[PDB]
Design a protein around this ligand. Structure first.
Ligand SMILES: *[C@@H](C)[C@H]1/C(=C/c2[nH]c(/C=C3N=C(/C=C4\NC(=O)C(CC)=C4C)C(C)=C\3CCC(=O)O)c(CCC(=O)O)c2C)NC(=O)[C@@H]1C
Ligand SMILES: *[C@@H](C)[C@H]1/C(=C/c2[nH]c(/C=C3N=C(/C=C4\NC(=O)C(CC)=C4C)C(C)=C\3CCC(=O)O)c(CCC(=O)O)c2C)NC(=O)[C@@H]1C
Ligand SMILES: *[C@H](C)[C@H]1/C(=C/c2[nH]c(/C=C3N=C(/C=C4\NC(=O)C(CC)=C4C)C(C)=C\3CCC(=O)O)c(CCC(=O)O)c2C)NC(=O)[C@@H]1C
Ligand SMILES: *[C@H](C)[C@H]1/C(=C/c2[nH]c(/C=C3N=C(/C=C4\NC(=O)C(CC)=C4C)C(C)=C\3CCC(=O)O)c(CCC(=O)O)c2C)NC(=O)[C@@H]1C
Ligand SMILES: *[C@H](C)[C@H]1/C(=C/c2[nH]c(/C=C3N=C(/C=C4\NC(=O)C(CC)=C4C)C(C)=C\3CCC(=O)O)c(CCC(=O)O)c2C)NC(=O)[C@@H]1C
Ligand SMILES: *[C@H](C)[C@H]1/C(=C/c2[nH]c(/C=C3N=C(/C=C4\NC(=O)C(CC)=C4C)C(C)=C\3CCC(=O)O)c(CCC(=O)O)c2C)NC(=O)[C@@H]1C
Ligand SMILES: *[C@H](C)[C@H]1/C(=C/c2[nH]c(/C=C3N=C(/C=C4\NC(=O)C(CC)=C4C)C(C)=C\3CCC(=O)O)c(CCC(=O)O)c2C)NC(=O)[C@@H]1C
Ligand SMILES: *[C@H](C)[C@H]1/C(=C/c2[nH]c(/C=C3N=C(/C=C4\NC(=O)C(CC)=C4C)C(C)=C\3CCC(=O)O)c(CCC(=O)O)c2C)NC(=O)[C@@H]1C
Ligand SMILES: *[C@H](C)[C@H]1/C(=C/c2[nH]c(/C=C3N=C(/C=C4\NC(=O)C(CC)=C4C)C(C)=C\3CCC(=O)O)c(CCC(=O)O)c2C)NC(=O)[C@@H]1C
Ligand SMILES: *[C@H](C)[C@H]1/C(=C/c2[nH]c(/C=C3N=C(/C=C4\NC(=O)C(CC)=C4C)C(C)=C\3CCC(=O)O)c(CCC(=O)O)c2C)NC(=O)[C@@H]1C
Ligand SMILES: *[C@H](C)[C@H]1/C(=C/c2[nH]c(/C=C3N=C(/C=C4\NC(=O)C(CC)=C4C)C(C)=C\3CCC(=O)O)c(CCC(=O)O)c2C)NC(=O)[C@@H]1C
Ligand SMILES: *[C@H](C)[C@H]1/C(=C/c2[nH]c(/C=C3N=C(/C=C4\NC(=O)C(CC)=C4C)C(C)=C\3CCC(=O)O)c(CCC(=O)O)c2C)NC(=O)[C@@H]1C
Lengths: 194, 172, 289, 162, 172, 162, 172, 162
């Protein structure tokens, strides 16, 4: 079944920004630069930060990192391995609805916020029909991902800060923590103090 | 983000006028105290683990319900996340201290953090309490005069304390 | 032999080219044919200007004063050979060129590099050329009266590693061995040192992805260490070599040549992606199982 | 607002790291440069009007057609002359901002970003602004570190315009 | 390497089939066209130096940057390699015309030629322009009305034009 | 490999732009620090062996059981004592490298990355190494910019281990 | 990447020993050269558009075949791609100058560039010719005696020239 | 959470297919193991206090310094002993949870995930908890499938710690 048609919305990423490199330009972590082992660590940690916000060493995938270091796989393949990892399924898939899993997939794969509720609704059926890896591969092979980050660059929040403004949009790791109020009340939180 | 110089630059550009003599002298005074700012940043950075750890232990001693089973700091993963959050808040106030302006701390760490902690059930008041303990440990570290050139660091300490209470208010 | 892939490679013109032998009591056409074959093969299909022709060596070969082998030796020892192949090349490249010209095959291992570089350094270029020509391999293959020719087909003492390296040294019929993409660089230094092979990429006529060459560093390895795990569920992994990547433009495109290990289930999508970026597929090799 | 301080913070934040001695050394270099940058800004500010007026005449002298032919993009009338003086004043004021800041960030976000389509849409020749910036270089009367830093900003603008 | 007959043979052998009646009749039609093919081969061959020299002269006239110092056809060695290239391409077009199949062209003449031209810095577009000059000259020579038995050589001319196009496209 | 020069170039290269005055000030800060770092490394190198022997003894004093408990992970024999002295020497040598390089790059490259796995699988207590670094801080006998830069590297190692 | 200091550091750790006094002394001499290096970086940077445009103009004057139709620098996008490449090569040359090591130039710029250019048909010899023209222009900018403190920059000039040579050898 | 039933449904859900015979066999294996796991959990629960006291005391015997030197991470005071007995109880209680669930999932979600961060932050040697778990190994008095499953969980914790 084809994806539902949903209208786009005005976004910074959809429009030409005339960007000049500055402190608010996201760092381009790319393997095209022949990175040393410490610079490779920085790239790997950026991918962990992009995908898992933070990665405890229980959440790390040392085999995936070794494959990325050796050139076995691309940066996009490493991003896919992070999304298919146990950490991502438990934190972001299991503890959220399908609609709030599409967000946390659009936000950190495409580097942009979801257009509307309709986009979340349209893409939420993909997990249950084409499989979990089906959703991951559709977003990674999309023209948006490839035109923006390609194979060798870690994705990032695109066009978060406009020039001259003190504050841009909220970072997606702040805007959308791993779980929402739904899993919050299943856990019994919030706790009363004193 | 903005730093101490660029904040005045952004205000001046909005008014469309050159920096006045008084504003340039104020920035010169800022440069004059820049060594104090750098070593205060260095002192907090070199004691980051101790500041985070002591504050966390103090918080769980004063609020045992955080660590009893069912608490938001109970289990190793939640506890490590709490420690991580302490360290993140500390890292961003050092960033704010380094720039001399609170734009990076607000834009990258604080803005929307209250909603994040509401969405997760993290008690924001207790996070604020932890940040106050971090402030106390960090100000003691910045202020001891052992192994450093003597001077008046009251202005930078007041700036650091302002960043810390800014963090505590944002998470509350 | 090579039948289906002969035209794809540059092997087809040499499949119907019989070895050029100078029979005893040869005619004048026979002598001239040997001269043409030796110039083409020993000098690697370079155009030979009239001022560069070795008139005396040709006369001696015509007269029977020297044999085909001695004429090959004279051509290989000439200043003409040395300007084309010795004076501007790293000696490993000189060894590669000697094996291609005097023996019609690629070097097999680093031991040959060791022997020839030591012999050149200890006794000179002329002594090194003699070892190629006085070798047992030369005598059994060409002997005294046969012009050396490319030995594409399998033989008695071959290694298949030599067959792969032949197409690193040979780049087509209308190619001249000084007019190749790597220019003066040694084509086999990394390969002989590591005892590895590269996927065979055919010449520019029949192969769209002919221009693919791996970079100095940041190259995708041949085999897929890790299996299908980084790709979720996958059946088999394939290494695809892609050349002429230009469409997105810099900085999106850094290197125009890229090797990717992709699963079977993404091969269709990979082909479309190559088409959008304007690239050409050089080779596809099984990378797993 | 690219400055030494914001980039040091940006570099540390992109790696999720505290501020090491590398960032501290970045700040020390900023402190070494800052007093010269501030004094350069004051010197340009006090001489801003004469620099702007002289720059307009240098552009007018080198491109006399700008003061002759009619058109919205030319300075044949008082309206065009006022627009030109305002643009050169914009360039001079933002260079002082860059001297204060310690980076090209003020030029980057107030002027340089998008200036190409600004010049193209309104048919403004970038060579005009190049000559205005060249005059500012020749007549700002700076020396030492202040001159080097100010000329770096001015040549950054000239390079972006050419 | 194939000709018009062996090309049909190779395709049939891969399919494992006997040549059909239509294929035999088509080859019979090719045989009936054989005299005109031989005349075209002989005519191009007989005027080969004139074809090559005039086309080269025309090419250097409208592309003088080729022959000025530093140009790729400057110095007698390069100019002569250029002339040899033109004659070789013309010769292989006669080969292809003779066999009735293009295989001798792309198996030998165009096999690795583009790698040669890219590696040497030879302008492939200029070589293609020269090949077009030989094309127009050679087609006029083949279609020369005088000194030959009258008939229709349009099919042979189209085939020769195709061989010349293959050569030009292989280098452009 | 973190170092102000490499970091400045990486930031500029990520932005795809030429080095500006911001990166020049980064280099100026590196130049201001580099000499003091070099004599810090020289002084640490000259007093390397005594500091290492002293740090081993300080660790053995604070954790007495390491010298009287059998097991591969302790220093109750000469093999354990040699490996302990070797580890402290590695820390000291890489700290000198950081002082030479002007950043924590040598520590990250050679010692910090993967040290937790090492201390865990070989059940080595990171508190031992923290105490060794603490003794080195107390006894390296540096002053001024040298002391400050050196203590930043030693505290970076301590923070990584704690 | 490596700079001048980390290259010496890396060799020492591979060998596993403290830096000797001679290596420390060599690094001190490099530090005393630091201001000249920053000036050279700034002078090449400040004239970057002029260096690239004049070098390109001279290159297309000496090699008109590049900009004639069918040439590789012909058509506006290819012409734009050429100019951008010259600027990129120049930019990475200044990076190598800034770090004091060619690792950034080799790893990030020259890695695969020879292979890239032959895959696209870009004539590498002409790119090398263009790199030379930028090279003489930039060394003249670096050695300009007007408006700068007196001294001998011959070591920096030789080092910058070496970086250009690497760039020109790599692309050819 | 790693448990045979949860993993069976998770893997069937992740590719959007109904529960085939493979997940049925997984459930059959879970049913075979379930009674032994429940009996093992009850046995470990019944003398949980004796098990915890003996394991904590065993840690004190192998590590007497933990009860002697003063420190927040040590059990010199009653506070520290209470924290230690509480920690061993958490380990043992979660092990009983794993026995009930049929997989290491309760250990993964409650204890293992971010245990590393904790031991380092609070200077808790993982070797301490390893000896406690080895006491639970040697003194649970289980047999057959109950011993085998319980030992697998305890060795899983040991392998994670060491
Ligand atoms: C309040 C925060 C405390 C304090 C600070 C203080 N520091 C200085 C002076 C300097 N501090 C430095 C710092 C460093 N040197 C380095 O190389 C590095 C490593 C990267 C650092 C962090 C420097 C360079 C100076 C100047 C030289 C000097 O040693 O004096 C002062 C003096 C005034 C000034 O701003 O220069 C002061 C006041 N002093 C206290 O009493 C507080 C406990
Ligand atoms: C188009 C190619 C032109 C053309 C050709 C044409 N030729 C013939 C006929 C013949 N031509 C030959 C050729 C040769 N005889 C020789 O001995 C040699 C040298 C070895 C050659 C090249 C022969 C034998 C014939 C048949 C007898 C005859 O002389 O006529 C025809 C007629 C039809 C046919 O195919 O036989 C044609 C059309 N004529 C044109 O008008 C074109 C310009
Ligand atoms: C006992 C073997 C040794 C020992 C124990 C000890 N532990 C702590 C502190 C903590 N222990 C934990 C562990 C957990 N919390 C959980 O929720 C779980 C998973 C369900 C585990 C495994 C944590 C998080 C802490 C820190 C928070 C707290 O204050 O409790 C201490 C105190 C450390 C301190 O600095 O206060 C001690 C003493 N001590 C010994 O000497 C024994 C050998
Ligand atoms: C400790 C003082 C208190 C505490 C903390 C706590 N936090 C979380 C979880 C998260 N915290 C964040 C924080 C940030 N997102 C950002 O982008 C930034 C930096 C720029 C911050 C500060 C996020 C996103 C999460 C959720 C994702 C994750 O944890 O990986 C937890 C864990 C809750 C959970 O199950 O995720 C905890 C325990 N809790 C207390 O009880 C203390 C008062
Ligand atoms: C038979 C089971 C399958 C098969 C085989 C097949 N092989 C070739 C051609 C060659 N085989 C080799 C292999 C080697 N050369 C060596 O020197 C060594 C030993 C050291 C090996 C193993 C080579 C290099 C060739 C090509 C050169 C030559 O054949 O002389 C062919 C011929 C292919 C062709 O004609 O193009 C065939 C058919 N084919 C099948 O279908 C079987 C599955
Ligand atoms: C000595 C200071 C260091 C060293 C040297 C070393 N080199 C090799 C091997 C080779 N060296 C070359 C060199 C050249 N080839 C050429 O064409 C030219 C001249 C134009 C040169 C300089 C080659 C090709 C080889 C390979 C062949 C051979 O092995 O002889 C070795 C041996 C490598 C091996 O493992 O076999 C060695 C030892 N090694 C050191 O440790 C010194 C720092
Ligand atoms: C100018 C002097 C010469 C010239 C250049 C030319 N280059 C291209 C295309 C590309 N050049 C690159 C190069 C790089 N990629 C890197 O990563 C780096 C180092 C960091 C460099 C310099 C790339 C990737 C391309 C392809 C994509 C793109 O165009 O952006 C072209 C266009 C070729 C085409 O077919 O479109 C040209 C014209 N041409 C000459 O003739 C000069 C000698
Ligand atoms: C002076 C060198 C030449 C000249 C000037 C001229 N400029 C305009 C119009 C505009 N100038 C700008 C430029 C800026 N605006 C900004 O905010 C900044 C950055 C802070 C800059 C550099 C813009 C945007 C415009 C158009 C909008 C506006 O009117 O402000 C004009 C008028 C063009 C028109 O169509 O009205 C003129 C005449 N004219 C000359 O002849 C001089 C050589
Ligand atoms: C060498 C190619 C040419 C040369 C160089 C040279 N420069 C100096 C001195 C300095 N140059 C600077 C540089 C800057 N100051 C700034 O504020 C900026 C912008 C951020 C820059 C680029 C500095 C700070 C100095 C030191 C103080 C001074 O003004 O002299 C020297 C002198 C020795 C030294 O290394 O300091 C030299 C030799 N001089 C030539 O003649 C060459 C053409
Ligand atoms: C003058 C002595 C007599 C004369 C000259 C003449 N020459 C040509 C054409 C060519 N001349 C050359 C020569 C060279 N080109 C080189 O690159 C070099 C080496 C550096 C040399 C010596 C060549 C190659 C040509 C052909 C290509 C070209 O035209 O440039 C012509 C034109 C001939 C033609 O067919 O167009 C003429 C007229 N002719 C006389 O009668 C003079 C007495
Ligand atoms: C002339 C129209 C253009 C031109 C040509 C030119 N070509 C070369 C060099 C070579 N040409 C070939 C081509 C062939 N050799 C063959 O054997 C075959 C048939 C199978 C072909 C098609 C080869 C292989 C070479 C290299 C050999 C050699 O000795 O050069 C050059 C010489 C380049 C140089 O000397 O550097 C030239 C000049 N150049 C132009 O400008 C014209 C557009
Ligand atoms: C000394 C403070 C205490 C101590 C030491 C001790 N260490 C080991 C074993 C290892 N130490 C390391 C550490 C490093 N290797 C490196 O390459 C670097 C980075 C440059 C470091 C920090 C490693 C990896 C090992 C294991 C392998 C090896 O032996 O090198 C042991 C022996 C452990 C064992 O044999 O299993 C010991 C005893 N012991 C004490 O009691 C001191 C308090």
């Amino acid at each position: 079944l084809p994806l539902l048609n949903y209208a786009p919305k005005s976004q910074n990423v959809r429009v030409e920004g005339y960007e000049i490199g500055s402190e608010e330009k996201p760092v381009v972590f790319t393997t095209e630069n022949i990175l040393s082992s410490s610079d490779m660590d920085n790239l790997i940690e950026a991918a962990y930060r992009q995908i898992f916000f933070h990665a405890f060493k229980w959440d790390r995938e040392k085999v995936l990192e070794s494959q990325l270091r050796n050139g076995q796989i691309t940066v996009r393949d490493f991003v896919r391995g992070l999304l298919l990892s146990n950490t991502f399924r438990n934190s972001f898939y299991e503890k959220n609805s399908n609609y709030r899993f599409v967000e946390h997939c659009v936000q950190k794969i495409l580097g942009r916020d979801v257009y509307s509720e309709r986009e979340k609704i349209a893409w939420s059926i993909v997990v249950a029909t084409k499989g979990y890896q089906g959703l991951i591969d559709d977003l990674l092979n999309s023209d948006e991902y490839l035109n923006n980050f390609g194979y060798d660059t870690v994705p990032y929040q695109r066009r978060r800060n406009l020039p001259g403004r003190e504050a841009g949009e909220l970072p997606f790791n702040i805007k959308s923590p791993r779980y929402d109020a739904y899993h919050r009340r299943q856990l019994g939180f919030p706790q009363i103090v004193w | 983000m903005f730093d101490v110089f660029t904040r005045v630059v952004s205000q001046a550009d909005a008014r469309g006028e050159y920096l006045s003599g008084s504003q340039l002298d104020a920035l010169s005074a800022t440069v004059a105290e820049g060594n104090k700012r750098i070593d205060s940043v260095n002192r907090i950075t070199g004691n980051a683990s101790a500041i985070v750890s002591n504050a966390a232990r103090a918080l769980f001693a004063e609020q045992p319900q955080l660590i009893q089973p069912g608490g938001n700091a109970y289990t190793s993963r939640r506890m490590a996340a709490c420690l991580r959050d302490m360290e993140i808040i500390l890292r961003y106030v050092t960033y704010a201290t380094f720039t001399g302006d609170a734009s990076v701390l607000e834009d990258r760490c604080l803005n929307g953090l209250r909603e994040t902690y509401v969405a997760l059930g993290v008690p924001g008041a207790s996070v604020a309490a932890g940040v106050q303990k971090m402030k106390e440990a960090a100000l003691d570290i910045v202020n001891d005069p052992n192994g450093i050139t003597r001077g008046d660091c009251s202005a930078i300490v007041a700036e650091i304390a302002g960043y810390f209470d800014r963090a505590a208010a944002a998470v509350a | 032999a090579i039948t289906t892939a002969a035209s794809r490679l540059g092997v087809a013109p040499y499949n119907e080219s019989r070895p050029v032998e100078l029979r005893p009591d040869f005619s004048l056409d026979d002598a001239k044919m040997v001269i043409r074959a030796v110039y083409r093969q020993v000098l690697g299909n370079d155009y030979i200007m009239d001022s560069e022709r070795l008139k005396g060596a040709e006369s001696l070969l015509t007269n029977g004063s020297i044999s085909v082998r001695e004429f090959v030796r004279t051509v290989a020892k000439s200043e003409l050979y040395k300007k084309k192949f010795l004076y501007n090349n790293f000696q490993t490249r000189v060894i590669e060129l000697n094996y291609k010209h005097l023996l019609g095959r690629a070097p097999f291992s680093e031991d040959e590099v060791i022997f020839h570089l030591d012999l050149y350094e200890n006794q000179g270029f002329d002594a090194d050329i003699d070892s190629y020509i006085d070798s047992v391999e030369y005598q059994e293959n060409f002997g005294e009266n046969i012009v050396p020719y490319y030995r594409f087909n399998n033989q008695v003492g071959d290694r298949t590693v030599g067959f792969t390296r032949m197409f690193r040294l040979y780049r087509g019929y209308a190619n001249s061995d000084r007019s190749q993409l790597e220019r003066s660089s040694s084509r086999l230094a990394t390969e002989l040192g590591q005892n590895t092979v590269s996927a065979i990429v055919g010449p520019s006529g029949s192969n769209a992805g002919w221009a693919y060459r791996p970079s100095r560093a940041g190259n995708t390895p041949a085999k897929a260490l890790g299996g299908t795990v980084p790709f979720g569920q996958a059946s088999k992994l394939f290494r695809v070599e892609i050349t002429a990547i230009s469409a997105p433009g810099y900085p999106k495109v850094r290197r125009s040549n890229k090797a990717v290990i992709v699963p079977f289930e993404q091969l269709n999508q990979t082909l479309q992606q190559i088409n959008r970026l304007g690239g050409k597929v050089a080779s596809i090799t099984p990378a797993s199982l | 607002m690219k400055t030494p301080l914001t980039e040091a913070v940006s570099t540390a934040d992109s790696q999720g790291r505290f501020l090491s001695s590398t960032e501290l050394q970045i700040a020390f270099g900023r402190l070494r440069q800052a007093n010269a940058g501030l004094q350069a800004a004051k010197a340009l500010t006090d001489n801003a009007q004469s620099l702007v007026n002289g720059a307009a005449q240098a552009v007018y002298n080198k491109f006399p057609y700008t003061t002759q032919t009619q058109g919205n993009n030319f300075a044949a009338d008082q309206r065009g002359k006022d627009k030109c003086a305002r643009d050169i004043g914009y360039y001079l004021r933002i260079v002082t901002y860059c001297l204060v800041a310690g980076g090209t960030g003020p030029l980057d976000e107030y002027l340089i970003a998008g200036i190409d389509e600004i010049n193209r849409t309104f048919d403004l020749s970038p060579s005009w602004y190049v000559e205005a910036l060249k005059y500012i270089k020749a007549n700002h009367g700076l020396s030492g570190d202040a001159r080097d830093e100010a000329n770096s900003y001015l040549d950054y603008a000239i390079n972006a315009l050419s």
